[PDB]
């Protein structure tokens, strides 16, 4: 999915009328300085921009402790930024050596007098966008749902008519905003809904959605999940996608358009079909093994996708065997068997392959696999394939 830095999703919100803390992003200690000055704020928050959590109590390789600092003095922002940029920030949530910090956000520090939870999401169950909110802010909405379902409020929004003033006001009132603040929040809700539609979000979650003592309604923090299918019309947003904190193979697979998800097993597997891939991961587990990954080559099953898949699984050093299960797709099996033995020879894979091919030209397919001289076992069906792959690893 698309991953935005805090500064990026806040920019997205502010460029769209949503109220967020004023802020600038800096590349250099010096820019951090000038930015702290431009803010004209009583108090400033300096935050390292990395995607991982635990920044607050993380540690830089410069020795500086804390990825989030508060100060009233611009020059301290500059000095601290100098001890952040270019260094690695490690938190209880990044690899051991931390993540290089290339940018810092310098923002006005606002006090939060009240915290509520506000979310807008495409809900399958309601056939459309739902406004979900709770007076119980700053906490995971799931916990609140377990402990106090009575405090979770939902408004199903009609996609054709849009959000109604009535709906926004009622939600604001339900989140406990009062007097002028209720109209301000109701208004921020409408802007969030528009934002949600404009960027093809499947979910915009503001937590906390709250107010400052000076009576301001502010989206202090937000997480946005985007609809991958909308990429063709959200090019600028997807371009901002930060892949600097993703598992390399995950990234590589994406270059070649493959749905790759790493797991901690040693039996690699590739399948054409999301369902079949999930089922394969499942049946490997049912049979006592640990899948190394989920990989969907899709139903358009091309020889080059098979080859790229093998190239990808070459990067994982944990792989001890590969279960190939292909059934479906417009390409006959003999062409798939070909790309397999070619991949094997050329990428010089030495691990056993358990292959299950079903479809057109299976006979010839079985022949190509048998005469390859490669350590290839041809499975009867899926269960047989799982049992044989499991029998092939430690």
């Amino acid at each position: 999915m698309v991953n935005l830095q805090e500064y990026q999703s806040k920019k997205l919100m502010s460029d769209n009328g949503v109220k967020v803390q004023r802020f600038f992003v800096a590349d250099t200690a010096n820019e951090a300085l000038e930015a702290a000055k431009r803010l004209n704020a009583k108090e400033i928050v300096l935050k390292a921009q990395i995607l991982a959590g635990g920044r607050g109590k993380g540690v830089f390789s410069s020795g500086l402790k804390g990825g989030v600092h508060l100060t009233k003095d611009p020059e301290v922002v500059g000095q601290l930024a100098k001890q952040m940029i270019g260094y690695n920030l490690a938190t209880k949530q990044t690899p051991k050596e931390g993540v290089k910090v290339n940018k810092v956000m310098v923002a006005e520090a606002l006090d939060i007098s009240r915290e509520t939870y506000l979310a807008i999401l495409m809900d399958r169950s309601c056939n459309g966008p739902v406004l979900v909110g709770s007076p119980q802010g700053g906490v995971d909405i799931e916990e609140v749902a377990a402990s106090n379902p009575e405090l979770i409020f939902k408004e199903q929004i009609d996609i054709i008519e849009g959000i109604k003033d009535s709906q926004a006001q009622r939600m604001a009132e339900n989140l406990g905003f009062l007097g002028p603040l209720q109209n301000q929040a109701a208004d921020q809700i409408k802007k969030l809904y528009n934002l949600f539609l404009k960027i093809d979000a499947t979910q915009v979650e503001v937590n906390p959605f709250g107010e400052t003592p000076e009576g301001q309604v502010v989206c202090f923090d937000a997480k946005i999940n985007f609809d991958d299918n909308a990429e063709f019309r959200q090019k600028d947003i997807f371009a901002m996608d930060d892949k600097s904190e993703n598992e390399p193979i995950e990234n590589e697979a994406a270059k070649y358009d493959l749905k790759y998800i790493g797991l901690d097993g040693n039996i690699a597997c590739f399948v054409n079909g999301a369902g079949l891939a999930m089922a394969t991961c499942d049946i490997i587990f049912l049979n006592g093994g640990k899948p190394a990954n989920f990989l969907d080559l899709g139903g358009g099953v091309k020889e080059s996708q098979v080859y790229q898949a093998f190239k990808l699984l070459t990067a994982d050093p944990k792989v001890e065997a590969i279960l190939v299960n292909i059934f479906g797709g417009i390409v006959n099996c003999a062409i798939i068997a070909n790309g397999i033995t070619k991949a094997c020879r050329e990428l010089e894979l030495k691990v056993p392959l358990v292959v299950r091919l079903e479809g057109t030209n299976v006979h010839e397919a079985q022949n190509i696999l048998t005469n390859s001289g490669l350590p290839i076992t041809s499975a009867v069906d899926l269960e047989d394939a799982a049992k044989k792959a499991v029998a092939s690893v430690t």
Partner: protein, 306 residues
Amino acid sequence: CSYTASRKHLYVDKNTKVICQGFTGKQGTFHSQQALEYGTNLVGGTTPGKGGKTHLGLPVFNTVKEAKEQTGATASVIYVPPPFAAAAINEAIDAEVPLVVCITEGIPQQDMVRVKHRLLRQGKTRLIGPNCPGVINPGECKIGIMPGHIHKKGRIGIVSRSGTLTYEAVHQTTQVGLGQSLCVGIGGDPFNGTDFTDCLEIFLNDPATEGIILIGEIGGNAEENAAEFLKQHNSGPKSKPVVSFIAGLTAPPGRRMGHAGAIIAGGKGGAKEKITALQSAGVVVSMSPAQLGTTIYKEFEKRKML
């Protein structure tokens, strides 16, 4: 008037006449050819701006309305690229084509929420998909992308959120000689035109469908709704054997597992809950996807239905 009223259009057969939207494109072209080879009554297709041409020896039209009037098609299959697919479906709905099968994968969710909004407020058009393999009545009518040769006309009705997993179930029920009455792939997207209960209703009322295989996976609550429908309609006095397999037991939460709708989000949409819900509705859940055929076979044996 009511959308549930169009449920019956799901049952394609030898008399179903089909047009292809996105007919001149590479995918529309390829499956149209396979459809003709299978014996499906493909009677033409549309591609805006290419009307007045023939393609694959059939007429091409600029609009679904012209195609429908000139051929009497009662079904449309859509292979249009995602940016135009919602317009393609809306056009078919406006033309009141009884059955629309949208194969297209990749349509924006927001686009489908809009389509579904119109869809639910009319009852002439039944939509299956998007992101689905289609529907097939073995030996009579194939609309979509499934391999035709593994199918065998018979007694088991199959409904599934997954294409490839359906091929498993068909291959297995064909091997044990049961065969299939009708196979419907409702697709992998979160917002779509036909759910499991829509198909179950058709299956429960169909004399030719003596048993049912339901294939689901993580995400949403379509399976749980199907278990409710069955508790009400298939728990006596009427009762057809229903077997199921639910993919995703071991899926990691929070990741879209290939299918845009295959995701455990907010701790909701997990596999175990779907299995439990089905079992309590009388469904026999096969834990293994390799055992669907044999599981439903034993159910038939137990009931002395062989």
